[PDB]
Amino acid sequence: QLRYSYDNLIGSSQLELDSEGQIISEEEYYPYGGTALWAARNQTEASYKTIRYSGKERDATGLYYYGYRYYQPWIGRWLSSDPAGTIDGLNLYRMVRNNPVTLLDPDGL
């Protein structure tokens, strides 16, 4: 089964389309990454989408896995302190400078 993804500015997957360009599923997000709207033509078919907010996988735990760290969308902050230290300012837990509609984090580093 071919599943084409159609993404917004920061890479969040909003439409999945099939080989004929018909809608498989639809998803919209809160700014910090929680899922606000989820719909699909079939429940079982829907279950196979794994890449969502910002082009990252949401694990069964609810966490987003961004390479070097895990992210908690329900409070807009990282699960652990930035391994790269002050590379993005003193606050080692802040998510994309608190500007998540404009900015994305490629890997949590």
Short mmCIF file of N, CA and C in Angstrom, two decimals:
data_model
loop_
_atom_site.label_atom_id
_atom_site.label_comp_id
_atom_site.label_asym_id
_atom_site.label_seq_id
_atom_site.Cartn_x
_atom_site.Cartn_y
_atom_site.Cartn_z
N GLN A 1 0.81 -1.22 0.00
CA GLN A 1 0.00 0.00 0.00
C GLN A 1 0.84 1.27 0.00
N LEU A 2 0.71 2.07 -1.06
CA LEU A 2 1.36 3.38 -1.12
C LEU A 2 0.58 4.38 -0.27
N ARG A 3 1.32 5.11 0.55
CA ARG A 3 0.75 6.15 1.40
C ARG A 3 1.62 7.40 1.21
N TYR A 4 1.08 8.37 0.47
CA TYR A 4 1.76 9.65 0.26
C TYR A 4 1.41 10.60 1.39
N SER A 5 2.40 11.27 1.95
CA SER A 5 2.16 12.25 3.01
C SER A 5 2.22 13.69 2.50
N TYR A 6 1.31 14.53 2.99
CA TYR A 6 1.27 15.95 2.61
C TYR A 6 1.44 16.82 3.85
N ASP A 7 2.54 17.58 3.89
CA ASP A 7 3.00 18.19 5.13
C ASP A 7 2.88 19.71 5.14
N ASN A 8 2.83 20.30 6.34
CA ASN A 8 2.78 21.76 6.48
C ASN A 8 4.19 22.35 6.52
N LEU A 9 4.31 23.62 6.91
CA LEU A 9 5.61 24.31 6.91
C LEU A 9 6.71 23.60 7.71
N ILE A 10 6.37 23.03 8.86
CA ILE A 10 7.41 22.44 9.69
C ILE A 10 7.52 20.93 9.53
N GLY A 11 6.81 20.37 8.55
CA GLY A 11 6.94 18.95 8.24
C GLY A 11 5.87 18.07 8.87
N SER A 12 4.87 18.68 9.49
CA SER A 12 3.81 17.89 10.12
C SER A 12 2.89 17.26 9.06
N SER A 13 2.69 15.95 9.17
CA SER A 13 1.92 15.21 8.18
C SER A 13 0.42 15.42 8.42
N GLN A 14 -0.26 16.02 7.45
CA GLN A 14 -1.68 16.34 7.64
C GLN A 14 -2.62 15.49 6.80
N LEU A 15 -2.21 15.18 5.57
CA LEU A 15 -2.98 14.28 4.71
C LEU A 15 -2.13 13.10 4.32
N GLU A 16 -2.72 11.91 4.36
CA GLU A 16 -2.15 10.72 3.73
C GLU A 16 -3.04 10.38 2.53
N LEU A 17 -2.46 10.23 1.34
CA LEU A 17 -3.23 9.88 0.15
C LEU A 17 -2.79 8.53 -0.41
N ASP A 18 -3.72 7.78 -1.02
CA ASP A 18 -3.38 6.49 -1.62
C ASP A 18 -2.90 6.61 -3.06
N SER A 19 -2.71 5.47 -3.71
CA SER A 19 -2.12 5.41 -5.05
C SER A 19 -2.99 6.11 -6.09
N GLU A 20 -4.25 6.35 -5.76
CA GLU A 20 -5.16 7.04 -6.67
C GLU A 20 -5.42 8.47 -6.21
N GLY A 21 -4.72 8.89 -5.15
CA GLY A 21 -4.88 10.26 -4.66
C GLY A 21 -6.14 10.48 -3.83
N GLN A 22 -6.70 9.39 -3.30
CA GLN A 22 -7.86 9.48 -2.42
C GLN A 22 -7.38 9.60 -0.98
N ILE A 23 -8.18 10.26 -0.15
CA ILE A 23 -7.77 10.51 1.22
C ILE A 23 -7.86 9.26 2.09
N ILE A 24 -6.72 8.85 2.65
CA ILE A 24 -6.67 7.76 3.62
C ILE A 24 -6.97 8.27 5.04
N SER A 25 -6.30 9.36 5.42
CA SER A 25 -6.43 9.92 6.77
C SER A 25 -6.15 11.43 6.80
N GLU A 26 -6.64 12.11 7.84
CA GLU A 26 -6.48 13.55 8.00
C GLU A 26 -6.12 13.84 9.45
N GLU A 27 -5.18 14.75 9.65
CA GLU A 27 -4.70 15.04 11.00
C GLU A 27 -4.35 16.52 11.13
N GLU A 28 -4.74 17.12 12.25
CA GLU A 28 -4.32 18.48 12.54
C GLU A 28 -3.75 18.53 13.96
N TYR A 29 -2.85 19.48 14.21
CA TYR A 29 -2.09 19.52 15.45
C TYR A 29 -2.29 20.81 16.24
N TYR A 30 -2.13 20.73 17.56
CA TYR A 30 -1.94 21.92 18.38
C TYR A 30 -0.51 22.43 18.14
N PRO A 31 -0.26 23.73 18.38
CA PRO A 31 1.06 24.31 18.06
C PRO A 31 2.27 23.53 18.60
N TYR A 32 2.19 23.03 19.84
CA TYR A 32 3.31 22.29 20.43
C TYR A 32 3.29 20.78 20.12
N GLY A 33 2.36 20.35 19.27
CA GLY A 33 2.46 19.01 18.70
C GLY A 33 1.41 17.98 19.08
N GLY A 34 0.57 18.29 20.07
CA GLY A 34 -0.54 17.42 20.38
C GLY A 34 -1.46 17.28 19.18
N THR A 35 -2.18 16.17 19.08
CA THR A 35 -3.08 15.96 17.96
C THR A 35 -4.48 16.48 18.32
N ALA A 36 -4.98 17.42 17.53
CA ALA A 36 -6.27 18.06 17.76
C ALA A 36 -7.43 17.42 16.98
N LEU A 37 -7.09 16.77 15.87
CA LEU A 37 -8.09 16.28 14.93
C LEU A 37 -7.52 15.07 14.19
N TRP A 38 -8.25 13.96 14.22
CA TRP A 38 -7.79 12.72 13.62
C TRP A 38 -8.98 12.02 12.99
N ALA A 39 -8.83 11.66 11.72
CA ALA A 39 -9.94 11.09 10.95
C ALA A 39 -9.37 10.19 9.87
N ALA A 40 -10.13 9.16 9.51
CA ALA A 40 -9.68 8.23 8.48
C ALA A 40 -10.86 7.49 7.89
N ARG A 41 -10.64 6.90 6.72
CA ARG A 41 -11.73 6.21 6.03
C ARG A 41 -11.99 4.83 6.63
N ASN A 42 -11.01 4.33 7.37
CA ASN A 42 -11.06 2.99 7.94
C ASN A 42 -10.13 2.95 9.16
N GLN A 43 -10.60 2.38 10.27
CA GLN A 43 -9.84 2.39 11.53
C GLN A 43 -8.52 1.61 11.47
N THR A 44 -8.61 0.39 10.96
CA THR A 44 -7.44 -0.47 10.81
C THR A 44 -6.41 0.19 9.89
N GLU A 45 -6.86 0.69 8.74
CA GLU A 45 -6.00 1.43 7.83
C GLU A 45 -5.32 2.61 8.52
N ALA A 46 -6.08 3.32 9.36
CA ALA A 46 -5.55 4.48 10.06
C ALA A 46 -4.44 4.10 11.01
N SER A 47 -4.55 2.92 11.62
CA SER A 47 -3.58 2.52 12.64
C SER A 47 -2.11 2.51 12.17
N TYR A 48 -1.88 2.46 10.86
CA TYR A 48 -0.50 2.32 10.34
C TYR A 48 0.28 3.62 10.12
N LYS A 49 -0.35 4.76 10.34
CA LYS A 49 0.38 6.02 10.29
C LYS A 49 1.24 6.15 11.55
N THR A 50 2.55 6.41 11.39
CA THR A 50 3.43 6.56 12.56
C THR A 50 4.16 7.91 12.59
N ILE A 51 4.44 8.48 11.41
CA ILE A 51 5.06 9.80 11.29
C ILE A 51 3.99 10.89 11.30
N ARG A 52 4.09 11.84 12.23
CA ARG A 52 3.04 12.85 12.39
C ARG A 52 3.60 14.26 12.57
N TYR A 53 3.58 14.76 13.81
CA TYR A 53 4.05 16.12 14.07
C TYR A 53 5.51 16.28 13.68
N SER A 54 5.78 17.37 12.98
CA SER A 54 7.14 17.76 12.60
C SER A 54 7.96 16.65 11.95
N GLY A 55 7.29 15.72 11.27
CA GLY A 55 7.99 14.65 10.58
C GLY A 55 8.69 13.67 11.50
N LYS A 56 8.17 13.54 12.73
CA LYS A 56 8.74 12.62 13.72
C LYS A 56 7.76 11.55 14.10
N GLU A 57 8.28 10.42 14.56
CA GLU A 57 7.42 9.34 15.02
C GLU A 57 6.88 9.62 16.42
N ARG A 58 5.58 9.43 16.58
CA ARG A 58 4.99 9.40 17.92
C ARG A 58 4.91 7.95 18.37
N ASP A 59 5.65 7.60 19.42
CA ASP A 59 5.63 6.23 19.94
C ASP A 59 4.32 5.96 20.69
N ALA A 60 4.07 4.69 21.02
CA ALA A 60 2.85 4.30 21.73
C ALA A 60 2.76 4.94 23.10
N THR A 61 3.88 5.44 23.61
CA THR A 61 3.94 6.07 24.92
C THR A 61 3.33 7.48 24.90
N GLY A 62 3.16 8.03 23.71
CA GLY A 62 2.75 9.42 23.58
C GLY A 62 3.93 10.35 23.30
N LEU A 63 5.15 9.87 23.52
CA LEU A 63 6.33 10.71 23.32
C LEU A 63 6.65 10.82 21.84
N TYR A 64 7.21 11.95 21.42
CA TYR A 64 7.79 12.02 20.07
C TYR A 64 9.28 11.71 20.13
N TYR A 65 9.74 10.81 19.26
CA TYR A 65 11.16 10.54 19.22
C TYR A 65 11.84 11.40 18.16
N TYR A 66 12.62 12.39 18.62
CA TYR A 66 13.40 13.25 17.75
C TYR A 66 14.85 12.87 17.95
N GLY A 67 15.39 11.94 17.20
CA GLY A 67 16.80 11.56 17.36
C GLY A 67 17.56 11.51 18.70
N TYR A 68 17.93 12.67 19.23
CA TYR A 68 18.77 12.72 20.43
C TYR A 68 17.98 12.87 21.72
N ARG A 69 16.71 13.23 21.61
CA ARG A 69 15.84 13.39 22.78
C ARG A 69 14.40 13.01 22.45
N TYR A 70 13.61 12.79 23.50
CA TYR A 70 12.19 12.54 23.38
C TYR A 70 11.45 13.81 23.81
N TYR A 71 10.31 14.07 23.18
CA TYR A 71 9.59 15.33 23.37
C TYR A 71 8.19 15.05 23.90
N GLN A 72 7.72 15.87 24.85
CA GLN A 72 6.37 15.74 25.43
C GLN A 72 5.44 16.84 24.90
N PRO A 73 4.64 16.53 23.87
CA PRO A 73 3.81 17.58 23.26
C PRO A 73 2.73 18.16 24.20
N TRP A 74 2.32 17.43 25.24
CA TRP A 74 1.25 17.92 26.10
C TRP A 74 1.68 19.07 27.02
N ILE A 75 2.99 19.30 27.14
CA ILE A 75 3.49 20.45 27.89
C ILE A 75 4.59 21.24 27.16
N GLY A 76 4.79 20.92 25.88
CA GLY A 76 5.75 21.63 25.06
C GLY A 76 7.16 21.70 25.62
N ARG A 77 7.68 20.56 26.08
CA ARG A 77 9.05 20.55 26.58
C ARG A 77 9.73 19.19 26.46
N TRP A 78 11.06 19.21 26.38
CA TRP A 78 11.85 18.01 26.22
C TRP A 78 11.84 17.15 27.48
N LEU A 79 12.04 15.84 27.28
CA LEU A 79 12.04 14.89 28.39
C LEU A 79 13.35 14.94 29.19
N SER A 80 14.38 15.57 28.63
CA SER A 80 15.71 15.61 29.25
C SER A 80 16.50 16.84 28.78
N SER A 81 17.61 17.14 29.44
CA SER A 81 18.33 18.36 29.10
C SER A 81 19.13 18.18 27.82
N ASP A 82 19.22 19.26 27.06
CA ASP A 82 19.94 19.28 25.79
C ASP A 82 21.39 18.79 25.98
N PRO A 83 21.74 17.64 25.35
CA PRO A 83 23.09 17.05 25.31
C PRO A 83 24.15 18.00 24.72
N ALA A 84 23.71 19.00 23.96
CA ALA A 84 24.64 19.95 23.36
C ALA A 84 24.77 21.22 24.18
N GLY A 85 24.31 21.20 25.43
CA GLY A 85 24.49 22.35 26.31
C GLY A 85 23.86 23.64 25.82
N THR A 86 24.61 24.74 25.93
CA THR A 86 24.06 26.06 25.68
C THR A 86 23.97 26.43 24.20
N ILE A 87 24.03 25.44 23.32
CA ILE A 87 23.91 25.66 21.87
C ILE A 87 22.68 26.52 21.46
N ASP A 88 21.61 26.49 22.26
CA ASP A 88 20.42 27.28 21.97
C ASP A 88 19.97 28.09 23.19
N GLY A 89 20.92 28.66 23.92
CA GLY A 89 20.59 29.46 25.10
C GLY A 89 20.71 28.68 26.40
N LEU A 90 20.51 29.35 27.54
CA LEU A 90 20.69 28.70 28.83
C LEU A 90 19.64 27.65 29.18
N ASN A 91 18.42 27.77 28.67
CA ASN A 91 17.36 26.86 29.09
C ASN A 91 17.46 25.53 28.35
N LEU A 92 17.85 24.48 29.06
CA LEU A 92 18.16 23.22 28.38
C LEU A 92 16.93 22.34 28.10
N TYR A 93 15.73 22.84 28.42
CA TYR A 93 14.51 22.08 28.18
C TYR A 93 13.54 22.77 27.22
N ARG A 94 13.80 24.04 26.92
CA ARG A 94 12.88 24.84 26.09
C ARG A 94 12.73 24.27 24.68
N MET A 95 11.49 24.25 24.17
CA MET A 95 11.19 23.73 22.84
C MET A 95 11.18 24.82 21.78
N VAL A 96 12.07 24.68 20.79
CA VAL A 96 12.20 25.62 19.65
C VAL A 96 11.94 27.09 20.00
N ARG A 97 12.58 27.55 21.07
CA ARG A 97 12.46 28.96 21.48
C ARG A 97 11.01 29.37 21.70
N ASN A 98 10.17 28.43 22.13
CA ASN A 98 8.75 28.72 22.37
C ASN A 98 8.03 29.36 21.16
N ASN A 99 8.45 28.95 19.97
CA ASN A 99 7.92 29.50 18.72
C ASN A 99 7.68 28.32 17.77
N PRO A 100 6.82 27.38 18.18
CA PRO A 100 6.76 26.10 17.45
C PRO A 100 5.93 26.12 16.17
N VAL A 101 5.24 27.22 15.87
CA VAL A 101 4.53 27.31 14.59
C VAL A 101 5.51 27.76 13.51
N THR A 102 6.52 28.50 13.94
CA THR A 102 7.48 29.06 13.01
C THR A 102 8.69 28.13 12.86
N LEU A 103 9.11 27.51 13.96
CA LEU A 103 10.39 26.77 13.96
C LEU A 103 10.20 25.29 14.20
N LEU A 104 11.17 24.50 13.76
CA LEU A 104 11.14 23.07 14.02
C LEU A 104 12.48 22.66 14.60
N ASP A 105 12.52 21.50 15.25
CA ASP A 105 13.78 20.96 15.74
C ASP A 105 14.11 19.70 14.92
N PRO A 106 15.23 19.73 14.18
CA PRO A 106 15.48 18.59 13.27
C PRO A 106 15.83 17.29 13.99
N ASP A 107 16.40 17.36 15.20
CA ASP A 107 16.88 16.13 15.83
C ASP A 107 16.94 16.13 17.36
N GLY A 108 16.48 17.21 17.99
CA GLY A 108 16.49 17.31 19.44
C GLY A 108 17.87 17.59 20.04
N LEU A 109 18.82 17.99 19.20
CA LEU A 109 20.19 18.20 19.69
C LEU A 109 20.47 19.59 20.25
#
